[PDB]
Design a protein around this ligand. Sequence first.
Ligand SMILES: Cc1cc2nc3c(=O)[nH]c(=O)nc-3n(C[C@H](O)[C@H](O)[C@H](O)COP(=O)(O)OP(=O)(O)OC[C@H]3O[C@@H](n4cnc5c(N)ncnc54)[C@H](O)[C@@H]3O)c2cc1C
Ligand SMILES: Cc1cc2nc3c(=O)[nH]c(=O)nc-3n(C[C@H](O)[C@H](O)[C@H](O)COP(=O)(O)OP(=O)(O)OC[C@H]3O[C@@H](n4cnc5c(N)ncnc54)[C@H](O)[C@@H]3O)c2cc1C
Ligand SMILES: [Cl-]
Ligand SMILES: [Cl-]
Ligand SMILES: [Cl-]
Ligand SMILES: [Cl-]
Ligand SMILES: [Cl-]
Ligand SMILES: [Cl-]
Ligand SMILES: [Cl-]
Ligand SMILES: [Cl-]
Ligand code: NI
Ligand code: NI
Ligand code: NI
Ligand code: NI
Lengths: 453, 451
Amino acid sequence: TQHFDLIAIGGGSGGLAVAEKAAAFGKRVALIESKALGGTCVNVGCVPKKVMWYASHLAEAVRDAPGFGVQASGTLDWPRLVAGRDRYIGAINSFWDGYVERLGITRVDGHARFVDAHTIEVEGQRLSADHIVIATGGRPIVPRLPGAELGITSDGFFALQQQPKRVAIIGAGYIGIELAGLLRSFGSEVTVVALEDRLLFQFDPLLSATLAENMHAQGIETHLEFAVAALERDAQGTTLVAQDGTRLEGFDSVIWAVGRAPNTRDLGLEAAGIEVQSNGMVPTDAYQNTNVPGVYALGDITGRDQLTPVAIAAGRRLAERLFDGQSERKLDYDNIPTVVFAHPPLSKVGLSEPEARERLGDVLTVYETSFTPMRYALNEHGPKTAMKLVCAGPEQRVVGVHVIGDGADEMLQGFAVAVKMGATKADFDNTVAIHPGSAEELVTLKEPVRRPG
Amino acid sequence: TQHFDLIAIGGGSGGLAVAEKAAAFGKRVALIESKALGGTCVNVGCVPKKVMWYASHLAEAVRDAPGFGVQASLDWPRLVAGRDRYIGAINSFWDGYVERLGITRVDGHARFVDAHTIEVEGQRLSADHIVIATGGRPIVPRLPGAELGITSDGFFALQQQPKRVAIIGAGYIGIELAGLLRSFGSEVTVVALEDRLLFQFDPLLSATLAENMHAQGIETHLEFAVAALERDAQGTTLVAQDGTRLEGFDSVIWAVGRAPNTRDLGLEAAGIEVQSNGMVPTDAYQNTNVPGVYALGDITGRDQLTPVAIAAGRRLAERLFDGQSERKLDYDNIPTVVFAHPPLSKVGLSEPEARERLGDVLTVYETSFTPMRYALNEHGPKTAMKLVCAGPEQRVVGVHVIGDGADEMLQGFAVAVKMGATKADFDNTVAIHPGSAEELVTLKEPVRRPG
Ligand SMILES: Cc1cc2nc3c(=O)[nH]c(=O)nc-3n(C[C@H](O)[C@H](O)[C@H](O)COP(=O)(O)OP(=O)(O)OC[C@H]3O[C@@H](n4cnc5c(N)ncnc54)[C@H](O)[C@@H]3O)c2cc1C
Ligand SMILES: Cc1cc2nc3c(=O)[nH]c(=O)nc-3n(C[C@H](O)[C@H](O)[C@H](O)COP(=O)(O)OP(=O)(O)OC[C@H]3O[C@@H](n4cnc5c(N)ncnc54)[C@H](O)[C@@H]3O)c2cc1C
Ligand SMILES: [Cl-]
Ligand SMILES: [Cl-]
Ligand SMILES: [Cl-]
Ligand SMILES: [Cl-]
Ligand SMILES: [Cl-]
Ligand SMILES: [Cl-]
Ligand SMILES: [Cl-]
Ligand SMILES: [Cl-]
Ligand code: NI
Ligand code: NI
Ligand code: NI
Ligand code: NI
């Protein structure tokens, strides 16, 4: 009750990771979870998203099969997809429940709040530890706009027991785009709106442009620089009213996909004297330390890369640092690879061209290519893959790799290793190609499209 | 007719690469080709194989679709027609491109007449530099009834799907053809002289491939040496050299390797060293024993891969024609994919190879799992991976994967391995989640250590 080496607040990606490594170094660990182990990723995030992504991937494959001479009819049993998805997620949840007990971790059910710098209270029970790690994650934002409650979030999406016929998605970051692709692939009408002048604004403009092309060809309708002012009920759905009065209208499902807020609202951060930003993010140093000794934060609430393996690595490294004498141990937050699971997917590691220009000079040599992979050889209008290599300095060190198209979801993990090693263009070009496939295009880029100046 | 800087013999992967790069350095180039530009890879190799592999991949996708709630369900003539049209366009591209580059195309079979002269149907041509890139052809054993079987060439000539196939040889061609034929619903049995499939590959890959192929209903016979092929009722029979008789096969495919096209090439007349097996020895810079004569591609007996021919061809032209006197291909750590169902890929050394070259210095990491691809299917193939690391620093000397996504997974890892990546380099790389590649950077605790 005060003899814990560690309290991890939150049994999500970060919390599980720190608790597991700490328990593995023989430490006495308490883990607090108000909902389900696995957090957002397992229950309402990565896993259910990717399972549904496989279904839309197979639906595309059935559409494309006749072109290759493979007989295939062609329609989604949404209830069946949800049933198999939840069974799959359930088993992952059950694994973590059993594993947390196998590790000897003290599981505490309920919502934790700090009471002071080294103590939390959960449903009236106070607990202290030498180390308290905050990993409470986030939740979808619903803007404070008229009729906003007529909309649903990604949480409500994964709760849908039937497929909606006519979807409006508000926001074109990861989840907006991912959900758009899933739903349109299942044959829903899909419109996405976004405040920005292009989809996936945080990504390289070549990826935004090619994604826009692929989505248009899929029959997804898009509205750019479209600011939602309100939602209103019409006959047969809800409408979407823009700042300028434009009405969209008729959607049986409107999904808010406009970001995530950190679960730090009543965590008793004030009581413990822990610094927090107006946006609810908890500042940390490179070693996940808050301003209060013995208090750490990781995962989504730290305001850095909002990804599960970032939460996990940050957690594992912290436990190595605190409990295994590895005093210099920390996560490098540069060159973290990611995939956006559009149809076809995209992936990147490092800097987009404009980011690279912002952080570095015009020292940029940029290589790119577009092509139709052999995956669509015997189809009429397959999506074109696009790739960009962002290189910097006279030695053309690779500072960004960007890909959208078939196979992109498994392509870049190894390129992330090379980039973290400081690969140059020479390192890339001296690597023999694998043929035939798409990844070879990344090591056989010849003429740059842009050079310094 | 003698003012050529370059003669490339063979318009396949290697010849095209050297000719193209030399022509781009402003050189005067002659290209000799007896058949079709693009060589084996374009016409009867990588490209048709991969096209058919996509069909097979889509057949599996339709099999698996209902498990994910997606309703579903081979017209082989239609596959053949689309494949040939696709191949055709690549041929046509190279024909026009060779013309575009200003290369002098010579149709027909070249032979050396002396150290710096070839003759093609009576016409002699000399050049400062002659590059031999004549490729190979499928081996048909000299055994009774061997002519009853066909080769990979005959496979790609098939206008109808055969019902009951025997595949002889379990190198990459045999395994690949077995996989697509069985996904198309043919009966398939593969036989092999060795005690496991894909003997050149890591044993973890051979074993899980064996597992996947068995689950897909492919029948295999290991340590099975065919003595003869005999005609039976309704097909042809494999007779082993212990009397074992196999079946009434629609199609018997020899896939026991490829021989180099160097038999009738005038190599003797030019004084060019050539091995009893027909391979042409070269130094690290593609040089033969005679100055001004080079060999690249399959006939050099190194990695029998199209990108190896290409890179070797391109580097040679840089060396000969752009003053890059030290330019050469590194033949270490060449990545490859075997297009089984699911595919496999490797770069670097298998565990036994690494043992032999490096000794008892290996830290080996393995994992097996069922990727999320088969989450809602009943019996998906399990992915398996091995990291072969060496020394105290655990330098990554081999990366091995079989399973879904393996065909696009390792090109990046090949760059890292070329850079001398260690296990620390891998582990310090943040995983992408969810997918399979992340398992390669999250291997914890080795299965074997030195000793
Ligand atoms: C729709 C969607 C798709 C995504 N797809 C991917 C993807 O493909 N790849 C990827 O890498 N990431 C993906 N993510 C992001 C990823 O899920 C998060 O970055 C990850 O879950 C962050 O881990 P975390 O530990 O910070 O928080 P979480 O995993 O959200 O865990 C926090 C936990 O703390 C609990 N909690 C909160 N407050 C308290 C309290 N005070 N007391 C006790 N418990 C508390 C919560 O119930 C939750 O279980 C996706 C996210 C979403 C929403
Ligand atoms: C079934 C199969 C599948 C394959 N799959 C892959 C794969 O997926 N990935 C990969 O990297 N590799 C693959 N390969 C191997 C790849 O095709 C070869 O390694 C590559 O073609 C070798 O290039 P090359 O220049 O040495 O020979 P080739 O491409 O075979 O070219 C040699 C050319 O020379 C011509 N020629 C021969 N003699 C003469 C003469 N004296 N005069 C004029 N012309 C002559 C021939 O007609 C031929 O066009 C595959 C091969 C096969 C057979
Ligand atoms: Cl897809
Ligand atoms: Cl145990
Ligand atoms: Cl409460
Ligand atoms: Cl909260
Ligand atoms: Cl031109
Ligand atoms: Cl002749
Ligand atoms: Cl010959
Ligand atoms: Cl496949
Ligand atoms: Ni205690
Ligand atoms: Ni106290
Ligand atoms: Ni001449
Ligand atoms: Ni002479």
